[PDB]
Design a protein around this ligand. Structure first.
Ligand SMILES: [Mg+2]
Ligand SMILES: [Zn+2]
Ligand SMILES: [Zn+2]
Ligand SMILES: [Zn+2]
Lengths: 557, 171, 107, 112, 178, 84, 97, 268
DNA sequence: ACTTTTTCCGG
RNA sequence: AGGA
DNA sequence: AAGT
């Protein structure tokens, strides 16, 4: 249950994507984030002012968050930060970094081609940011020299100086996380034969990226406000709060920290070695060694499943779970937690056919009706019935499980010392049992049809199976050979209208899939209906009279 | 100073109020919040003008809660003070530190240091006073202060002022 | 329109845009042997005026983007000499309505 | 235009082969979607999923992270017109029930 | 929830400069010379000289008592008692600010009559000064042009000394003798 | 931008979705103890009440039909034809 | 139980906009956050008790909104931010169309 | 894929079929603007038969002693013979019937008459017969103006798109072309009088019903048509069990827009 | 040279 | 490891 | 089993 907030409530109209500037990370940050140690202020069970809650979110459950006073269910996480000793590439941008080096001068930071070249001014025209970059790259990738002077937009005899620097451009190729270039050179007009082979430093690529003009990077995919190229190179790493990397604290004295917590620790661990290594008597090879390891961890934390094979693995052999891996399809945030969801007010059991049920009704076993609960508001129309169900308790059929006051507090009728003496008030919700003739959404998975999920009238019945009319067998595609089905219960008088008025079984009869009725008379009834209608088939008074009474809407004639 | 600002408050009405006395209940609920309210953005909202012609507009029914949200377009008299603004006000409180001045809805305090040197604190008077070679500044006395700086404090705006410069002080 | 048998040399092709506002079209003779427009599957395409396209957009409250597109290199877009931005009205037969009119803007 | 008519004929035939019948409009729409682009746009990860619709909508299928990485690097703006974006935001999607808005008129209330 | 206005500036990420407010007539973003009314038309800023402001609230609240008694169907020291009664009627009482304001105005007003406030507004709204200078000129009683130009240091070169001193003379005549 | 009543071009008839959202909305309000605009001739279900309110076109709600461009047509549940 | 992609589809098919919203919020995930009106992030240090709001970084103690999104979405957004990506959420629109 | 590809597509309040970008997929849903549930396979009688049998059916010649409508068909029978003014209407009428025959023979090349269309007219007429207790012995109280103009008037009201402009009005005439075709064929002067034997009331009733039933049949702005289509192809796909690649793998080949196809063929 | 999907639900 |  |  979440508390009242004086803050204007709106809906999200736009999602403006971008990159975090290192300046923003240091601003939004509630803590920095210096010690790999989780908590235990020298074994003393409570969070260290180093990693998790040096003002972040909050473990302990009891003991609320130091910053947003709220605590647990209300307190979102609070982001921190780690100021990295040397800059490092963000894994995901490794090639959009490389491709930007390929378009710009590796010394002056100017586009290798401009409004002077015609193929370039053609690509510069493109409106789609992704396609405009695509064309600009395929053009500037070949340009192996930064041009000093280029022929004027008329004659080759008079040449215009487009911009300074003449320097030869390196032939950039990647070596799993590192960018190694190979400058063309000169030496007595020839050379290469054997060029200049040196790996491009993260910091030098950054300084060039900083120098790329607004107009320039803007001509490429980029945006000056939300995504400048310099921001693809990580300077200041954001520390995600505990809600993101929960401490699965089994029992009292036993940690159980998340993989992301371990991985961030490894980053910190490596970041400290590098920092000290350089500040101290710098043995150079040792630095480029400790740097490359930091690049590894910062990389493997976001994505662990990289082509350049060392797959960072927890000492257990089992690899560390990437942030990428967490978001990756079918079962995994987007697909498994957002597009799909495990829900409440849902029930499932074996299905069985009933010829005495109506087309649109579903047989609901008592046990399930007694568990599933609709929240009805105490109104002058219901008050009297409602109190009787409240009195009836959570144990007998037409009964109720909870009562909810204006004060927002839940009253468990199963335990309340006031379960008998309970006087309802208008505006209170009574969580009553699923009763006869309530609309419920009934579905049989897979669900490749709009008709695989239809609304039905509840019919509370004995025996553990969901009973269903035989003609509705086909749309769901269910047989009674051990097939099971789902039942979802609407909570609003509004979500109910949607079920009853749009997706009820009778509405769903004549299908748009093939402009024909999608339900008919199947099995027994079909077989008997033939046998019954032959010219040879005659029925005596006795039976006729029963068959007439059996039709519920009989004229009595 | 003292403005006539066109503003608009989004009010969110419960369905039990969807009776004829709705435009009535809304207008009252507006005055409930807006009137007497104080922001740093617009200052003290004091009085809502033209009650009869308050624009309720159409209330949009909110998805899963039956409540309707209306943007109430209205016009009111506001008061937002600024630095450099010279205000006339009556004294309220007085101490060894200085004196406070009531200017409309806001209290402006004058430091002993933001006052001429000649005027000194006379503790031995009922009530406490500030005594110049010619002037006497005490509780009920009228003053003219230059507002030197403002602070937006929750449900108010307090300011610091000086009666040091020319054509300021006891009136 | 230049109707060639086997090829137009890359030297010669470099002179096609060089004379504006006039426009030039290259056409391999061997392609023209049969008219595509006469085929069963090819519906009537109609070039719209600047005033007609202005109206189509007003009447369906569209931005140029929001329209189905025809490629500049499209057999029919070539046959009709469609320039980028020009719209074709495609009057096709419908098993549903009898006559359905689509629209395609030139890319 | 002929590509459309061919592509439909070809689709329709797969259906009628198995014996089954699907109303025109359905196959018509699929065909028309692949087609409106100006050419044959595959119902694949690199086909339709590589179009100009909102990042979240696109990320709900196949390239997810890589999609979102680009979304940030190019500073994409999701319109939030798509279904997928409203399901992800826990909002009422502009679908059926949500394709319009409901308001009270004070005048028509003080009338009844 | 709080109050919004006609100014719909979309500060996309680019937060600040929230530049100072002064008698450089550089007041807020909100309190700008060019504004937009309900209707959408560009209207000028409305600044009131306390008396112009007293008569506004007086009117507003009086006409409010009318509407309240309509729906329910089915001399300075003495102006203060009269006012402090209307507040008890119309206002929620909780508005300690309006009660304080109404008294402050009732006392500090230069012009008592509506007829008088009109003539002040005429005389002043002909100089072309910013509504703020116009209010401060009608609010602060001045004698030397030096006085006014020193107290409203926005005036500085916007008017002749002799001109401001002609206006100051006529303002002194209009001043209703309590 | 808002389309004037005299210039409206949508159905004079009410959509299946409009009707289903009106009954849901009125049922939610009637259930939230809202004022009911018709004699509840023995009626106790907020949907049945809402259906009756609609039957006598006595629902004070207004459908804002939005167009792909953002422009819209405001139509009253009073004016909308319920053939359905 | 599961209300997966396929069941989402059928719900979209019927046109049950509210039913789906409710199935994914009320029936499951539903959570409330405080977001900055300047940099649409869950940055806001909402002390919803003392009525104090703030977003240091923006120095915004005023332009703050309340929003209802699934808890998994608060998560996704934090995870995207964890990887330097900013999924800035805005309550108004600039683009039109 | 079929779903994820089409999800965002639905019918808007301008009968236009659009995606999340507001880009037009179809100008009117399924080329006619009708809900697939409201459509039924009906026979377009004008399509086939001998050019001779067509004449026997739809031709009325008030200027000929043998091809006029017998006074047994209508009360006007006697006074209607030789009326030049009415023959202009029956000619107008017959001239459209022939235009339609030739039109249909373009749309449906093989002459297939069984096409799914809204409003089951066969039943409207059948029901008028029991509703009004149609006497196949007595002459109708219908005028030739009543029948001919009557159909013309109904046509003006079979509305799909509503806008007051040529673009929309032409689009409207278009989307309604085929239905009118059937309607004119089923409501021709001779057909009404000789076959059905409807009276003025019965005819007026048959008309208003078509109108209402037609109006009823149009798609609902909000219809999630994208997902609907995706599923209406997707599900039948699940029930799948010269020699060219067919079913599931051919469909797989299709959506993929695979160039390297298994069974390429040309039909010359 | 190089990547990614594949119907729905007790331990 | 197992159901439809 | 396909396709950058
Ligand atoms: Mg089975
Ligand atoms: Zn917190
Ligand atoms: Zn250079
Ligand atoms: Zn912020």
């Amino acid at each position: 249950g979440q508390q009242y907030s004086s803050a204007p409530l709106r809906t999200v109209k736009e999602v403006q994507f971008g990159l975090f500037s290192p300046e923003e990370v240091r601003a939004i940050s509630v803590a920095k984030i210096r010690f790999p140690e989780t908590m235990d202020e020298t074994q003393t069970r409570a969070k260290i002012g180093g990693l998790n809650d040096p003002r972040l979110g909050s473990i302990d459950r009891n003991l609320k968050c130091q910053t947003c006073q709220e605590g647990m269910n209300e307190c979102p996480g609070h982001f921190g930060h780690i100021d990295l000793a040397k800059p490092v590439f963000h894994v995901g941008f490794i090639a959009k970094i490389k491709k930007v080096c390929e378009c710009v001068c590796m010394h002056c930071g100017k586009l290798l081609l401009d409004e002077h070249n015609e193929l370039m001014r053609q690509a510069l025209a493109i409106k789609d940011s992704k396609k405009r970059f695509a064309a600009i790259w395929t053009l500037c990738k070949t340009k192996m020299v930064c041009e000093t002077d280029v022929p004027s937009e008329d004659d080759p005899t008079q040449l215009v100086s487009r911009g300074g620097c003449g320097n030869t451009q390196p032939t950039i190729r990647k070596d799993g996380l590192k960018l190694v270039g190979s400058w063309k050179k000169d030496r007595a007009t020839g050379d290469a034969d054997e060029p200049e082979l040196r790996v491009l430093s993260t910091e030098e690529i950054l300084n060039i990226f900083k120098h790329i003009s607004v107009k320039d990077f803007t001509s490429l995919g980029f945006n000056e406000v939300f995504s400048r190229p310099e921001w693809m190179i990580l300077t200041c790493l954001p520390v995600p709060p505990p809600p993101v990397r929960p401490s699965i604290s089994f029992n009292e004295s036993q940690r159980g920290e998340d993989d992301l917590t371990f991985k961030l620790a490894d980053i910190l661990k490596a970041n400290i070695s590098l920092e000290t290594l350089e500040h101290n008597g710098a043995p150079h090879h040792a630095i480029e060694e400790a740097e490359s390891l930091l690049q590894f961890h910062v990389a493997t934390y976001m994505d662990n499943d990289i082509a350049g094979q060392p797959q960072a693995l927890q000492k257990s052999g089992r690899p560390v779970k990437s942030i990428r891996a967490r978001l990756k399809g079918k079962e995994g945030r987007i697909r498994g937690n957002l597009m799909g969801k495990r829900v409440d007010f849902s029930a499932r059991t074996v299905i069985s056919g009933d010829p005495n049920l109506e087309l649109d009704q579903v047989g609901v076993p008592k046990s399930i009706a007694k568990t599933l609960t609709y929240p009805e508001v105490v109104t002058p129309y219901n008050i009297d019935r409602l109190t009787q169900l409240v009195r009836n308790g959570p144990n007998e059929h037409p009964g109720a499980k909870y009562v909810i006051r204006d004060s927002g507090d839940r009253i468990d009728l199963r335990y309340s010392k006031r379960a008998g003496d309970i006087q309802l008030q208008y505006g209170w919700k009574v969580e009553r049992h699923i009763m006869d003739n309530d609309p419920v959404l009934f579905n049989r998975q897979p669900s490749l049809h709009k008709m695989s999920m239809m609304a039905h009238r509840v019919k509370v019945i004995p025996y553990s199976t969901f009973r269903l009319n035989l003609s509705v067998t086909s749309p769901y595609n269910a047989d009674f050979d051990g097939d099971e089905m789902n039942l979802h219960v609407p909570q609003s008088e509004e979500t109910r209208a949607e079920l009853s008025q749009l997706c009820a079984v009778p509405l769903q009869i004549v299908s748009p899939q093939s402009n024909k009725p999608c339900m008919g008379i199947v099995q027994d009834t079909l077989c008997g209906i033939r046998k019954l209608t032959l010219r040879d088939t005659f029925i005596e008074l006795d039976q006729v009279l029963n068959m007439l009474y059996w039709v519920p809407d009989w004229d009595g004639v | 100073m003292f403005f006539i600002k066109d503003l608009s408050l989004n009010i969110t009405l419960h369905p039990s109020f969807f009776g004829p006395r709705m435009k009535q209940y809304l207008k009252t609920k507006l005055l409930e919040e807006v009137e007497g309210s104080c922001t740093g953005k617009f200052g003290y909202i004091l009085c809502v003008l033209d009650y009869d012609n308050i624009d309720i507009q159409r209330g949009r029914i909110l998805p899963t809660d039956g409540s309707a949200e209306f943007n109430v377009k209205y016009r009111a008299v506001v008061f937002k003070p600024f630095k450099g603004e010279v205000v006339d006000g009556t004294v309220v409180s007085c101490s060894q530190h200085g004196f406070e001045v009531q200017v409309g809805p806001m209290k402006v305090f004058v430091t002993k240091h933001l006052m001429p040197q000649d005027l000194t604190f006379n503790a031995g008077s009922n009530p406490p006073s500030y005594q110049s070679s010619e002037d006497v500044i005490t509780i009920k006395s009228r003053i003219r202060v230059k507002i030197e700086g403002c602070i937006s404090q929750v449900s108010s705006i307090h300011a610091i002022g000086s009666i040091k410069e020319d054509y300021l002080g006891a009136i | 329109i230049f109707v060639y048998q086997n090829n137009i040399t890359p030297s010669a092709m470099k002179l096609v845009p060089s004379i504006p506002p006039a426009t030039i079209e290259t056409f391999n003779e061997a392609a023209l042997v049969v008219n595509i427009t006469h085929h069963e599957l090819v519906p009537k395409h109609i070039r719209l005026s600047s005033d007609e396209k202005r109206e189509l957009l007003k009447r369906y409250r569209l931005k140029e983007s929001q329209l189905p597109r025809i490629q500049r290199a499209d057999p029919v877009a070539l046959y009709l000499g469609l320039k980028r931005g020009e719209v074709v009205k495609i009057i096709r037969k419908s098993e549903t309505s009898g006559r359905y009119a689509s629209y395609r803007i030139c890319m | 235009e002929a590509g459309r008519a061919a592509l439909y004929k070809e689709v329709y035939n797969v259906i009628a082969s198995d014996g089954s019948y699907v109303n025109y409009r359905h196959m018509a729409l699929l065909v028309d979607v692949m087609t409106t682009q100006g050419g044959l746009t595959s119902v694949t990860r690199h086909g339709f999923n590589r179009s100009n619709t909102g990042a979240l909508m696109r990320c709900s299928f196949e390239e997810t992270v890589e999609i979102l990485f680009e979304a940030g690097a190019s500073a994409e703006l999701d319109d939030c017109r798509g279904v997928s974006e409203n399901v992800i935001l826990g909002q009422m999607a502009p679908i059926g029930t949500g394709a319009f808005d409901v308001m009270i008129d004070e005048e028509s209330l003080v009338k009844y | 929830v709080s109050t919004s206005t006609f100014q719909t500036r979309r500060r996309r990420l680019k937060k600040v400069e929230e530049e100072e407010n002064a008698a450089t007539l550089q007041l807020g973003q909100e309190f700008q010379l060019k504004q937009i009314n309900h209707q959408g038309e560009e209207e000028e800023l409305i600044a009131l000289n306390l008396s112009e402001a007293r008569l506004v609230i007086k009117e507003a609240l009086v006409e409010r008592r009318r509407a309240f008694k309509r729906s329910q169907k089915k001399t300075r020291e003495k102006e203060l008692e009269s006012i402090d009664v209307l507040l008890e009627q119309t206002t929620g009482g909780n508005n300690k600010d309006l009660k304080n304001t109404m008294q402050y105005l009732t006392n500090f007003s230069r012009f008592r009559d509506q007829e008088t406030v009109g003539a002040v507004i005429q005389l002043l709204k002909s100089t072309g000064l910013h509504p703020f200078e116009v209010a401060q000129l009608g609010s602060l009683a001045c004698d030397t042009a030096d006085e006014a130009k020193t107290l409203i240091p926005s005036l500085n070169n916007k008017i002749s000394d002799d001109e401001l001193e002609r206006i100051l003379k006529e303002l002194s005549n209009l001043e209703t003798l309590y | 931008k808002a389309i004037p009543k005299d210039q409206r071009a949508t159905t004079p008839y009410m959509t299946k979705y409009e009707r289903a959202r009106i009954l849901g909305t009125r049922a939610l309000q009637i259930s939230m103890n809202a004022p009911v605009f018709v004699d509840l001739e023995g009626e106790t279900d907020p949907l049945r009440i809402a259906m009756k309110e609609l039957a006598e076109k006595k629902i004070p709600l207004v459908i804002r039909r939005y167009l792909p461009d953002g422009s819209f047509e405001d139509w009253s549940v009073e004016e909308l034809i319920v053939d359905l | 139980l599961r209300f997966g992609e396929m069941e989402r589809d059928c719900m979209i098919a019927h046109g049950a906009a509210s039913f789906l919203k409710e199935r994914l919020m009320e029936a499951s995930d539903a959570f409330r956050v405080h977001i900055c009106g300047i940099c649409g992030l869950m940055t806001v240090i909402a002390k919803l008790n003392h009525n104090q709001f703030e977003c240091k970084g923006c120095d915004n103690k005023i332009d703050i909104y309340q929003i209802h999104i699934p808890y998994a979405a608060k998560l996704l957004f934090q995870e995207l931010m964890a990887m330097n990506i900013t999924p800035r959420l805005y309550t108004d629109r600039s683009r039109d169309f | 894929r079929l779903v994820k590809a089409l999800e965002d597509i639905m019918v808007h309040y301008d009968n236009t079929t659009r995606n999340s970008l507001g880009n037009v997929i179809q100008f009117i849903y399924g080329e006619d603007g009708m809900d697939a549930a409201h459509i039924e396979k009906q026979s377009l009688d004008t399509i086939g038969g001998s050019d001779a049998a067509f004449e026997k059916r739809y031709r009325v010649d008030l200027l000929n002693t043998d091809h006029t409508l017998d006074p047994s068909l209508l009360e006007s029978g006697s006074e209607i013979l030789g009326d030049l003014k009415l023959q202009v209407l029956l000619d107008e009428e017959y001239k459209q019937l022939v235009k339609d025959r030739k039109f249909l023979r373009e749309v449906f090349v093989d002459g297939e008459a069984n096409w799914p269309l809204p409003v089951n007219i066969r039943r409207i007429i059948q029901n008028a017969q029991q509703t009004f207790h149609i006497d196949h012995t007595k002459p109708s109280d219908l005028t030739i103006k009543d029948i001919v103009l009557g159909v013309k008037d109904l046509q003006e009201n079979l509305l799909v798109l509503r806008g007051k402009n040529e673009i929309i009005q032409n689009a409207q005439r278009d989307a309604v072309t085929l239905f009118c075709c059937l309607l004119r064929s089923r409501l021709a002067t001779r057909r009404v009088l000789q076959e059905y034997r409807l009276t003025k009331q019965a005819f007026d009733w048959v008309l208003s019903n078509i109108e209402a039933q037609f109006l009823r049949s149009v798609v609902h702005p909000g219809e999630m048509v994208g997902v609907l289509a995706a599923q209406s192809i997707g599900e039948p796909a699940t029930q799948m069990t010269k020699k060219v690649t067919s079913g599931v793998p051919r469909l797989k080949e299709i959506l993929n827009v695979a160039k390297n196809m298994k069974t390429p063929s040309l039909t010359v």
